[PDB]
Amino acid sequence: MNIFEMLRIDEGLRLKIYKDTEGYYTIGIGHLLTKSPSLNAAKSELDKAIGRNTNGVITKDEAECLFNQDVDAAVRGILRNAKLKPVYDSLDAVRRAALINMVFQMGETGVAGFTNSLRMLQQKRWDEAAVNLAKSRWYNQTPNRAKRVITTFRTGTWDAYK
């Protein structure tokens, strides 16, 4: 198990434009296209991201291309952020993947707002962090995915994904 397989489980794979849990236009492996309600705006972003006239449908290779770019962007967003980098540096390899997962889903600014959870993770207070992480809109809106990520933070194992 690794971060690519983990996010592939959490995000799924769809080759046609769809709406995510929030109603935003998305494609591939959780690649957010736009938060605008216009399908034409989403098709325009898609063509721009892929470099061709797609008409809303991409191939599996194109979906994995965006996926690689998005995982790379998430990791580099963590390392550039003054609040996230110290937490990431303090974590073991499995818990680092859990932090990448969160950044992938809600963005670098959103995760950096979990000020109290991040401090508990840095102090390695795993049970207390898990309780604090669940007191969030994130947990209430996507509870099954949040539980898997929180369990990864709590245990340091991949057991939630087996």
Please identify every residue annotated as catalytic: 11, 20
Measuring CA to CA, how many Å separate 76 from each of 2, 62, 82? 17, 21, 12
Site for Cl ion in 10-69 (CB under 5 A): 49
Instruction: Compute the least distance from the CB of residue 81 to Cl ion, in Å.
Output: 19
Among the listed residues 35, 60, 59, 56, the one whose alpha carbon sits nearest the alpha carbon of residue 46? 56
Question: Which one of residues 10, 20, 45, 62 is an interface residue with ligand MTN (CB under 6 A)?
Answer: 62
The one-character DSSP state at 31 is E
The answer to whether 2 contacts ligand MTN (rule: CB under 6 A) is no
CA 150 to chain centre: 13
Instruction: Give the one entry of Cl ion, ligand MTN, none that residue 49 binds, where binding means its C-beta sits below a cut-off of 5 to 8 angstroms depending on kind.
Output: Cl ion
Token representation of residue 77: 């967003």
Q: Out of 53, 61, 82, 93, name the contact with ligand MTN by CB under 6 A.
A: 61
3-state SS assignment for residue 162? coil
Q: Provide the minimum distance between the beta carbon of 37 and ligand MTN in the complex, in angstroms, as a whole number.
A: 28
Specify the stretch interacting with Cl ion by CB under 5 A; choose among 11-19, 34-42, 105-113, 141-149. Answer: 141-149
What's the CA angle centered on 23, arms 21 and 28, to 5 degrees?
70
- Count of residues interacting with ligand MTN (CB under 6 A): 5
Task: Provide the 8-state DSSP code for 23.
Answer: S
Residues in region 64-93 near ligand MTN by CB under 6 A = 65, 68-69
Interface with Cl ion by CB under 5 A: which residues?
49, 142, 144-145
